[PDB]
Structure formats: structure tokens, C-alpha cells
Amino acid sequence: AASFAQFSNAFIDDLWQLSPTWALYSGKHVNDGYLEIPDEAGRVKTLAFVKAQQAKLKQFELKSLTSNETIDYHLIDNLLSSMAWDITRFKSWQWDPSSYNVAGGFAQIINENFAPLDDRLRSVLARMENIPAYYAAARGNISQPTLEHTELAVLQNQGAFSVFSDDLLKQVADSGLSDAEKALFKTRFDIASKAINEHISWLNAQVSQLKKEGARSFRIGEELYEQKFAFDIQAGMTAKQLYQKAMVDKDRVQGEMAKITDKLWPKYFTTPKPSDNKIAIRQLIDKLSTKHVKRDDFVSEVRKQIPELIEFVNQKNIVTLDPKKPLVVRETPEASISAPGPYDKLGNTYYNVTPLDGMSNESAESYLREYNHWILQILNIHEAIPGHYTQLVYSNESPSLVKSLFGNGAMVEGWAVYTERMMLEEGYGNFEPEMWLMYYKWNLRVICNTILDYSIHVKGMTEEQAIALMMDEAFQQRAEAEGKWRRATLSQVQLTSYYSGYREIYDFREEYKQLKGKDFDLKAFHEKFLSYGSAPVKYIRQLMLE
């Protein structure tokens, strides 16, 4: 009889046999030469896999599992339910033509310049076989598409030619493949190129028809939104509940900002203070944003700050940090943490911080105003200490393949957002009003991301309303607002992840303070919270309370 550990490993093996492209994206090259044709037999086969793996899952008593195993159990169960639901209910395979594009799988094979070239090219040689079939399947599946995803499909499939390029042909011509393999490659490449171009023509004809005749709305509606929110975020509340909390937080945050602005106004202006609080807040913020690190010192300011945050976390006993896992700041190759995937045992972990070269003087200045004297410190909390990097180190204490592959984005992001608030509450920057004001504008991004995503998909918010939210309520620039609208038209639920995890973590903390009273230790709370890795916050709560 298989143990749960044996089952977990067999499950991943079976998942990769069903979808070797998913394996490829996860960093395991089980069959790079096999292009899955996304037709009805594909869906039937996915649903037969869901059914068989679910029945294997149900053989394990939940009382028979350790804490890590129970996390894996739930992550697997939820992944399975959401696969089935994607096929039978959400049906993005019908209305999102952008989900049909071969370029991605090919780029992952080709762009590993360390992997043997002849092996890569032979994988590509085989993977090209079924490109015509792949796009024939696409056209037979697509039905009542949205205008927006069809437009995205055109643009992304046009990008396929930066992979299916003259440069790929040259690599093939000068490789160690046999002359017969080279000629086959050319034959298949011409057939592939023709098929991609004919599909793009078809997509163009569709966009044109959708513009004339009307198209399915991009707004997924309440029923689908709640189901997607449950599968993706795995919050301990509904989306409607989170939205209602986001509306209240927006008001609380703006009220605090108005108070700070009243106190700081005479310190920075001699002109009168506008009676509309929101114009006043916007003007004070624009003025404070001119204090920023000099452009050429951006990367150095970051290196200087990280040890300052380390010192502060140690001094205040916020969480144990290990001095011999020193974080290496590096100037980004072609600000975020990059870390090896579960199948990459070699790779190192860095803090990628992009120097401001390439950009115009004017873009650089706009960037430095966004990442100003205060916001740069908050960014380094979020990204490095005690945010993402710290949480990643803690998750390396008790890892599992399942958590590494299918872990919860809401928890990972929610933690990083939580740390910003917790650090300031614990005295970071010594309760400086400027710092709090800037933090609050930053917090509004996260709150308003939730309002926006929900209101668009559930409440029919218009483009003009979405732009006025982001600019007038969250004090963002035009370009940022427009980018956010576009992202919300093309994706659903992901935008709520930041606030959802933050709210659950902070509320769980306050609940735990209540339960332990005088015996509440902040540091012990943090370390125990981080010990489960990237599990959904509600499961961490349940394990910590049980």
C-alpha cells in the first residue's frame, strides 16, 4: 500500500506524463519533443486524470497525515478541482484565443544556452511536427471569444517569429545535427511558419468580425468570479467579503492620510492648503516624491539599506535572520528576488535591482519619484527583509515538491505586504509622518487593486470609473492607471491576491494576540507562521490553532 509520500511523487509523475509542457515550464524535461494538441481528446484525458487522482487521494485518511502532508493533500485536491472546473465551467479554452500559442514552449527549450544544443534542436525538430494540428484544434475549439483576448492572441502569436527566426535557422545550419536532420528541420519550419501565419490571418479575420458584430464580454461575472477566487486564492472568505473590507480600509487609510497632510502642510508649502483633502494629499505627495536617491547611486542605496533592515529586525526581535545567508544584490540581467525552481539544485538566489541606464533622463526621474526616499525603503522591506527573501529562506526549512510547484501566491504576497505594516508599527522610521504618508499611498495600491478587479468583473465598472479610482482614490499616474485597467480586462482574481493575503495574515495575527494575551510573542508568531512554507493562509491558521 503506497504511503502518502509515495503517492505525492507518483502524482507529480502522472501530471508530467499528462502534460509534459507543464513539466517543461516547471523545469523538468520529461518530453520536450511532444506538443500536446489542445483538442477534445486532451480535455477528456485531463478529466480522466482528475477522476483517477482524486480517487487515489480519497484513499488516505486525513488523520494519518503530518502537517506538511496535509498541506500537500489540500493543494493537490484544490488543483484537481480547479482543473476540472476550468474544463467544464470556466471554459477559457473557448473564449480566450490567447491560450493557443506554441511560442512559449519553444522559447523554454531554445533559450537554455547551457543545455546541449543538439538535444535542444532535436526536441524542437520533433515539437514542430504538430504545429498545424495545434492551431487547427485551436480554431475548432474557440467559440464566442472576447474581443480583448482575441487581440492579445494576434499580438502574442506575431511574437512567435522572434522564436521561429532566421537566428534559429542559423543555429540549426551550424549545429552538429546530420545533414538529413537539417533538411527535415527546414521542411518542418516552413510548414510551421505557414501554419502560424495562416492562424494569424484567421485571428485577424476574427477581430474584424468581433468589432462589427459584437463580442462576449471580458467580465466574467459573480458566479465564476467567486469560484475562481476560491480556487486561486483559497481565502477564508468570499470575494464579496474581501471587497467590503477593501472599501472600509480605503476610507480608513485616506482619513489617516488627510490627518498627516494637515500636520505636514505648512512644513512644505507657503501657498494655501486646498480644502479638498484629496487634492491636498496629492500635492503633498508629489512634493515629497522629489526627495529621492540620486540616479547613479540607486543600486548602492539598496545595498546600504539591506544591512540596515537586518539590524533593525535583530534589534527589535521581529524574526530570526541567519547572518551566513547574506543576500546578494545584483544589477538585473535582461526590483525582485530570483531564486531556483524545485528542479534546479545548482542555482543561486539574488536580489535583482535594475540600474537606471537605457531609460531617458525623464523616465529615470519618474521612476525615482515612484521609488523615492521613503518608498525605496518600503520596497526593500517587501522584497528582501523581512519580506520575500526572508519568507523564502523560512520555506526552504521544510520544503516539498508540491508546495514548490503549486504554492499559494496570496500567502507569499500577503506576507510581503504585511511586513511593511508590521515594520512601521514596530517603529521603523520612528513613526515619521512622511514615511507613514508614503506607506499609505503604497497600501492604497493593494486595496484599490481589489476594488478594481472585483468591480470590473462583478459590478460593471467602466474604464473611466476604473481610471478615476486609480488616479483620484489611489493617487496614481495616468500610465499606471491605464496599465491596471488593461491587466483587469485580460486577467481575473490575480489582482486581489496582494490584499487578500495581507488582510488574512493581519487579522489572524490580531486573533492570535487575543488568544494568547500576555503570552503573545511577536517573534514566535512570525517564525511559526513562516514554518509551513507557501500554504494558503487559512491552512496555516487552522494548523496553528489546532
Which residues are annotated as part of the binding site? 14, 29, 40, 74, 112, 251, 292, 301, 365, 373, 382-383, 388, 413, 463, 472, 546
Distance separating alpha carbons of residues 266 and 272, to the nearest angstrom = 9
Residue from 103, 107, 117, 471 in contact with Ca ion (CB under 5 A): 471
Residue from 286, 311, 397, 472 in contact with Ca ion (CB under 5 A): 472
Cβ nearer to Ca ion, comparing 129 with 181: 129
**Identity (one letter) of the amino acid at 226?**
E
Cβ nearer to Ca ion, comparing 314 with 491: 491
- Stretch in the footprint of Ca ion (CB under 5 A) among 37-45, 206-214, 234-242, 337-345: 37-45
Cβ nearer to Zn ion, comparing 53 with 489: 53
Say whether residue 286 binds Zn ion (CB under 5 A).
no
Output b/e per residue, 398-423; b: 16+ Cβ within 10 A: eebebbbbbbbbbbbbbbbbbbbbbb
User: Concatenated DSSP letters for 105-162?
Assistant: HHHHHHT-TTS-HHHHHHHHHHHTTTHHHHHHHHHHH--S-BHHHHHHHHHHHHGGGG
Measured N-to-C along each axis, helices 433-458 and 497-516 cross at an angle, to the nearest 10 degrees, of 120
Cβ nearer to Ca ion, comparing 137 with 335: 137
Cα(first)–Cα(last) distance of the chain, in Å?
29
Residue 14 interacts with which of Zn ion, Ca ion, none, CB < 5 to 8 Å by class: Zn ion
- Beta-carbon neighbour count of residue 307 at 10 Å? 12
Per-residue binding letters, 161-190, with Zn ion (x by CB under 5 A): ------------------------------
In SS3 terms, 146-167 reads as EHHHHHHHHHHHHHHHHCCCHH
The distance of closest approach from Cβ of residue 37 to Ca ion in the complex, given in angstroms and rounded to an integer, is 5
Cβ nearer to Ca ion, comparing 424 with 451: 451
Number of alpha carbons in the 13 Å side-chain half-sphere of residue 318: 26
Cβ nearer to Ca ion, comparing 276 with 334: 276
Hey, which residues does 338 pair with through a beta bridge? 350
Span 320-379, contacts to Zn ion by CB under 5 A: 373
Query: Which residues are documented as binding site for Ca(2+)?
Result: 463, 472
Strands of 3-116, DSSP E? none
Number of residues that bind Ca ion (CB under 5 A): 3
Instruction: Determine how β-strand 350-353 pairs with β-strand 328-331.
Output: parallel
The distance of closest approach from Cβ of residue 139 to Ca ion in the complex, given in angstroms and rounded to an integer, is 15
Distance separating alpha carbons of residues 381 and 398, to the nearest angstrom = 23
The distance of closest approach from Cβ of residue 44 to Ca ion in the complex, given in angstroms and rounded to an integer, is 10
Cβ nearer to Ca ion, comparing 41 with 248: 41
CB 97 within 8 A of CB 142: yes
Span 4-23, contacts to Zn ion by CB under 5 A: 14
Nearest CA among 461, 443, 442 for reference residue 452: 461
The distance of closest approach from Cβ of residue 475 to Zn ion in the complex, given in angstroms and rounded to an integer, is 16
Nearest CA among 18, 23, 24 for reference residue 41: 18
Residue from 119, 174, 223, 251 in contact with Zn ion (CB under 5 A): 251
- Stretch in the footprint of Zn ion (CB under 5 A) among 258-266, 389-397, 413-421, 448-456: 413-421
Cβ nearer to Zn ion, comparing 319 with 417: 417
Say whether residue 139 binds Zn ion (CB under 5 A).
no
Cβ nearer to Zn ion, comparing 251 with 472: 251
- Stretch in the footprint of Zn ion (CB under 5 A) among 191-199, 243-251, 443-451, 519-527: 243-251
Helix ranges (H only) for 352-399 are 361-370, 375-383, 388-395
Place of cell 541606464: 357
Instruction: Determine how β-strand 328-331 pairs with β-strand 336-338.
Output: unpaired
Cβ nearer to Zn ion, comparing 255 with 399: 255
- Stretch in the footprint of Ca ion (CB under 5 A) among 25-33, 49-57, 283-291, 470-478: 470-478
- Residues 427, 430, 431, 434, Cα dihedral to 10°: -130
Distance separating alpha carbons of residues 361 and 383, to the nearest angstrom = 26
User: Concatenated DSSP letters for 175-218?
Assistant: SS--HHHHHHHHHHHHHHHHHHHHHHHHHHHHHHHHHHH--B-S
- Stretch in the footprint of Ca ion (CB under 5 A) among 122-130, 178-186, 248-256, 466-474: 466-474
Residue 279 interacts with which of Zn ion, Ca ion, none, CB < 5 to 8 Å by class: none
The distance of closest approach from Cβ of residue 368 to Zn ion in the complex, given in angstroms and rounded to an integer, is 6
Hey, which residues does 28 pair with through a beta bridge? none
- Stretch in the footprint of Ca ion (CB under 5 A) among 36-44, 85-93, 134-142, 447-455: 36-44
Cell of 83: 482543473
Residue 373 interacts with which of Ca ion, Zn ion, none, CB < 5 to 8 Å by class: Zn ion
Taking each continuous run of H as one helix and of E as one strand, the counts in the chain are 26, 3
Residue 282 interacts with which of Zn ion, Ca ion, none, CB < 5 to 8 Å by class: none
CB 345 within 8 A of CB 354: no
Say whether residue 416 binds Zn ion (CB under 5 A).
yes
User: Concatenated DSSP letters for 306-340?
Assistant: HHHHHHHHHHTT-S---TTS--EEEEPP--EEE--
The distance of closest approach from Cβ of residue 383 to Zn ion in the complex, given in angstroms and rounded to an integer, is 7
Nearest 5°: CA angle at 99, between 149 and 163?
Answer: 105
- Stretch in the footprint of Ca ion (CB under 5 A) among 39-47, 135-143, 196-204, 341-349: 39-47
Query: Which residues are documented as binding site for Zn(2+)?
Result: 14, 29, 40, 74, 112, 251, 292, 301, 365, 373, 382-383, 388, 413, 546
The distance of closest approach from Cβ of residue 133 to Ca ion in the complex, given in angstroms and rounded to an integer, is 7
What is the 8-class DSSP label of residue 27? T
Residue 251 interacts with which of Ca ion, Zn ion, none, CB < 5 to 8 Å by class: Zn ion
Q: Which residues bind Ca ion (CB under 5 A)?
A: 41, 471-472
Q: Which residues bind Zn ion (CB under 5 A)?
A: 14, 251, 293, 373, 413, 416, 546
